[PDB]
Symmetry: C2
Subunit: 363 residues, 2 copies
């Protein structure tokens, strides 16, 4: 009901010592009080891109397992992400998530992020080439709540039909594409303003054809999701994207797979074998196959790579996604909003997570 | 000896209406006077990278022809630029440049910019592979005034030897290289803070290895040459670099060759054949080979592409290069500086240029 003497961190109002008051899942009072801080309090993290973690996958619909673990990473809202697959699996995953949300009305599961199958085979990376295909009027009809996000390649055939999804409370995101700057722009002019795990799975930035990568950097209101594991991007790259995009244009993401948190074993992603050596999962041919990055580590990493403030980390770890997903009462520690919060020690180790005014994790 | 009622534009003191008094080749008084501007006065343009123009070529040491024409572009300081060549033709070019300067004391020719032969063969652009080769203790003794700039590849063998040229009033600049971010840093740490015609002739930006391209975007005090002909960089690319680096980080350059200003056809640059279509010179396989851009158009294009201010235009077209070259008395409209000026109309066309208090061009 009340968290006192903390370093309160709001993406908009800044960071300051004070106390926060929670009344039945709603923050009713934020009082700035000058004293010595107990720890850090931030908006509950949001992971819009995670396949599985600690044995649980989205392909087997282990929502309950995923949810429960994520609380230990301070994540209070997530999107179980799929990989390229059959219209059949898709309908089944959307169906079980829909039932899962109806059964657990206070869950951290916002819905499903459909990564693929409408992507480029040339930038398929880790996606099963057999399932990749162009969008069809027949499939478009099966995509709706609980789908919340969709990653597509703008140059693919019939990519335009996907625009009809936005009115269904689905956010479109460009990724796994070789589209040029103008092809991406056709979609940017229609409201598509997000890029999936930048810059992996895109044609590089060239001197005349800047492509999607160039659009991503050039356009100020296009947000870029970044996997901060030191492998998908080097610390220098992250530092560069941060320099160009600032906190306002970056969305932290995990892109974690079931293997995360497990010994260097040997599993699969969809219908493909993956080898995990030193935490880095890759296909046999060397292609990165997701990550084993815990959201919590993502935040620490980002913070270390850039030297940004805890106020900026709040934007990249929750506020930015909330804005994309239309979650107007989340990603904030301000009077009138939902009490999804995470308490951390000064080193940013999670020590407590709150989802709807209820403590769902204590270390 | 007075140009009055113009819109004066100083890189540092900003823009204001006024009068400028010139005496004995020196700006003696700058006075802010209210009233409607006659035209636009700017510090004389500086081009540190130009091979040839209107039939005049650095390789043939057509210094006189180059100087005369550049005045109509408002350029009051330039560096005749070579390409990879024999030690022999290099000494001759330096020898004649020296003679030319001793004979025309108030000439716009500051000296020579040695582009090559210490570059990498993977990124030789239009350079002849036959002359590219590593530097040596001996070859270096042959390099000194009028040499004022040297473009080299940091990864090439013995590249470290080039650091000794700095104390001889020579600016080092990185280009035509597949140098990694770290190989570049060794030189950055030693004072190299410039990149030649960014980003043509450099390895592309990659997710883990950001290379020189990354280094040039990320490091703030590293300046970048930009050829704004709309071909070496698309207008979108120029807008990107501008956004990231700001006016302070950009040095406008022409990279113009002999063919510039002449009708399409076929000529040479060094020992190679070149085809010019629609004003775009290219080698037999399409490799870009210099340009046909007039400095005057360069200034207008940068402004159109970026929408920058007249004061910023002054920084990219003059001041930044003066700073890098140590011309403490140039690139300013201030009491005590050299009277090298360009007066343009409001559409930014050159109407008059002055070198050392002398009018050297009228439209
Ligand atoms: Fe992916
Ligand atoms: Fe070149």
């Amino acid at each position: 009901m009340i968290v006192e003497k903390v370093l309160i961190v709001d993406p908009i109002d800044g960071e300051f010592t004070g106390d926060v008051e929670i009344e039945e899942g709603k923050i009713v009072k934020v009082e700035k009080r000058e004293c010595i801080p107990r720890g850090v309090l931030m908006p509950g993290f949001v992971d819009p891109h995670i396949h599985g973690v600690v044995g649980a996958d989205t392909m087997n619909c282990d929502f309950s397992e995923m949810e429960e673990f994520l609380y230990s990473q301070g994540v209070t809202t997530f999107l179980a992400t799929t990989v390229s697959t059959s219209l059949e699996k898709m309908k089944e995953i959307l169906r079980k998530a829909r039932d899962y949300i109806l059964e657990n009305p206070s869950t951290s599961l916002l819905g499903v992020h459909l990564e693929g199958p409408y992507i480029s085979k040339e930038k398929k990376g880790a996606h099963s080439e057999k399932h990749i295909r162009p969008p069809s009027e027949r499939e478009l009809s099966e995509i709706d709540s609980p789908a919340k996000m969709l990653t597509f390649a703008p140059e693919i055939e019939s990519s335009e039909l996907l625009l009809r999804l936005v009115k269904r409370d689905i956010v479109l995101s460009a990724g796994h594409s070789i589209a040029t700057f103008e092809e991406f722009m056709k979609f940017y002019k229609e409201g598509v303003k997000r890029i999936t795990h930048f810059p992996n799975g895109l044609k590089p930035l060239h001197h005349r054809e800047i492509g999607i990568t160039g659009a991503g950097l050039l356009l100020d209101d296009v947000k870029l999701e970044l996997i901060c594991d030191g492998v998908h991007l080097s610390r220098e790259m992250v530092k560069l994207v941060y320099k160009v995009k600032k906190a306002n244009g970056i969305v932290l993401v995990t892109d974690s797979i079931s293997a995360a948190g497990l010994k260097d074993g040997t599993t699969t992603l969809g219908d493909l074998v993956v080898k995990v050596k030193d935490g880095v999962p890759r296909l046999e041919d060397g292609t990165l196959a997701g990550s084993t990055l815990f959201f919590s580590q993502a935040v620490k990493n980002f913070r270390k790579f850039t030297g940004c403030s805890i106020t900026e980390l709040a934007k990249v770890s929750s506020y930015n996604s909330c804005v994309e997903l239309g979650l107007d009462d989340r990603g904030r520690i301000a009077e009138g909003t939902r009490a999804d919060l995470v308490l951390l020690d000064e080193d940013l180790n999670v020590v407590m997570t709150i989802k709807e005014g209820e403590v769902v994790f204590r270390s």
